């Protein structure tokens, strides 16, 4: 038996991260990813710094000295093959400890910043070492853009799985079609936490809305009429964090939230704040409303609360997926 799984979703939703877990779970080497981790680091610090003056209102530095460090980062920003001298890390580290820069970090939904920003900036002293060895979590956080289609083959209890990873940005979606025919099932990934952000493509369209519209076009697609969709409501850790933080209200982006009350059949985790329960289930339902409205019997939608960088959770949810695929 051979199952062909197609990963779909908007850009930065977590599709590539899911594939990375499959290798970790079911499959000179990882030294090539060091450079990629270092790029994410340079990308994160330069984006926060360059964003300070453009915000409205503009965020100011807490330390005058750091202005020179700001000048340093912006001057090396466009450098092609950067050598990463030890000065760079000292500058990056200094800037990341400046409270002004952190205030600008808290407002990152107002601009375009990668997800692994805080994770790496907090590990500068680790990444800078010559004898640095990327941990498993480091490889899971590393962000590199997907262009083209990529097949990852693996086995779970002698059962074969062919997983296809695709680019999720607008211009990349035109290739998806090349994987529609003879697909066992689709796994749709959504950045549940990106409700207060806009997509890169135009800098205006809300990320969640884009995911919602993308789901509607997949669910109601003419060529996937009988194809089921396993829905990964990803980035649950970041959702919970934002919800509890109380600074960016969900109902200021999706007004309908103000009417929403947690369902009866809801199954929260142990000790989970009812506020987080409410938010995660609301997002879930916005997707179910679309799947509920059509198909009927031809195909079904199976949602799951996930966190792609958490290997435990992925083992758990993918095993749930195996039960869904085999039963029917």
């Amino acid at each position: 038996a051979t199952h062909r799984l197609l990963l779909l979703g908007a850009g930065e939703s977590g599709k590539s991260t899911i594939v990375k877990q499959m290798r970790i779970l079911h499959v000179g080497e990882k030294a090539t990813k060091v450079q990629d981790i270092k790029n994410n680091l340079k990308e994160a610090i330069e984006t926060i710094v360059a964003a300070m003056s453009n915000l409205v209102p503009p965020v100011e530095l807490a330390n005058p000295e750091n202005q020179f460090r700001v000048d340093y980062i912006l001057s090396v920003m466009n450098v092609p093959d950067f050598d990463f001298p030890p000065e760079f890390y000292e500058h990056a580290k200094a800037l990341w400890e400046d409270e002004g820069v952190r205030a600008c970090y808290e407002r990152s939904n107002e601009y375009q910043l990668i997800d692994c920003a805080q994770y790496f900036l907090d590990k500068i002293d680790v990444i800078k070492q010559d004898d640095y060895v990327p941990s498993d979590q480091d490889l899971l956080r590393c962000r590199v853009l997907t262009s083209g289609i990529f097949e990852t083959k693996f086995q779970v209890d002698k059962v074969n799985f062919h997983m296809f990873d695709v680019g999720g940005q607008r211009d990349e979606r035109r290739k998806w079609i090349q994987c529609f025919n003879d697909v066992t099932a689709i796994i749709f990934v959504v950045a549940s936490s990106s409700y207060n952000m806009v997509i890169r493509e135009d800098n205006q369209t809300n990320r969640l809305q884009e995911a919602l519209n993308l789901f509607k076009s997949i669910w109601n697609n003419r060529w996937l009429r009988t194809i089921s969709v396993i829905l990964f409501l990803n980035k649950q850790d970041l959702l919970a964090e934002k919800v509890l933080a109380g600074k960016s209200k969900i109902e200021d982006y999706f007004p309908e939230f103000a009417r929403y009350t947690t369902p009866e059949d809801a199954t929260p985790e142990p000790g989970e704040d009812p506020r987080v329960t409410r938010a995660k289930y609301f997002i879930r339902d916005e997707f179910l409303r679309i799947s509920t409205a059509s198909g009927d019997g031809r195909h079904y939608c199976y949602p799951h609360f996930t966190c792609a960088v958490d290997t435990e959770n992925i083992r758990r949810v993918f095993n749930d997926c195996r039960d869904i695929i085999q039963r029917m």
Binding site: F180, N181, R222, W223, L224, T226, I227
Partner: protein, 189 residues
């Protein structure tokens, strides 16, 4: 059925030949629509005869473009030879019609070998056809060929087992596609 049924199948180790008349739009402007068709029916009927003999399978006729494939429907290791032979008979056929009709008809022949997908597309007016980069390339060989000669690729040369005397084709200098794709071409003697 999500997608309509596709009547297409892949075939490796095949040779594609393209023949095209020079200045067809120019030629059609001068002579009658009636006589053009007679000169073309005379030419293509003969081509279709030569094709069955040389074991080539004619695909379509696009006004002045004539193309066939050797190695279909069943595999044949004699393929590259067939297409080369087919072009030989073609060029000679055009010469007889040039004199018999007194019309200025000239063609360029292009040959390439590789894999092709063949079959039909659509629901109505089915016509057997071939598609692939190799077919695309074969088409450009005709465009980058020379009047009254057979322009072949390195790939086609490797299937010919050295049975034909060739000379440097320099296809890269007459067609942008052949150059940008670093294709080595040869003209058959």
């Amino acid at each position: 059925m999500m997608f309509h049924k596709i009547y297409i199948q892949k075939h490796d180790n095949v040779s594609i030949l393209f023949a095209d008349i020079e200045g067809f739009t120019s030629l059609a402007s001068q002579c009658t629509a009636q006589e053009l068709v007679m000169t073309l029916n005379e030419l293509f009927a003969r081509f279709d005869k030569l094709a069955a003999e040389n074991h080539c399978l004619r695909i379509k006729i696009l006004g002045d473009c004539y193309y066939c494939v050797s190695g279909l429907p069943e595999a044949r290791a004699d393929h590259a030879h067939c297409c080369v032979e087919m072009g030989m008979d073609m060029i000679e056929a055009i010469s007889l019609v040039r004199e018999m009709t007194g019309v200025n008809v000239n063609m360029r022949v292009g040959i390439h070998s590789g894999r092709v997908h063949c079959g039909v597309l659509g629901l109505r007016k089915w016509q057997f056809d071939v598609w692939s980069n190799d077919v695309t390339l074969a088409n450009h060989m005709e465009a980058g060929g020379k009047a009254g000669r057979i322009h072949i690729t390195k790939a086609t040369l490797s299937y010919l087992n050295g049975d034909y005397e060739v000379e440097p084709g320099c296809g890269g200098e007459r067609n942008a596609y052949l150059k940008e794709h670093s294709i080595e071409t040869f003209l058959i003697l």
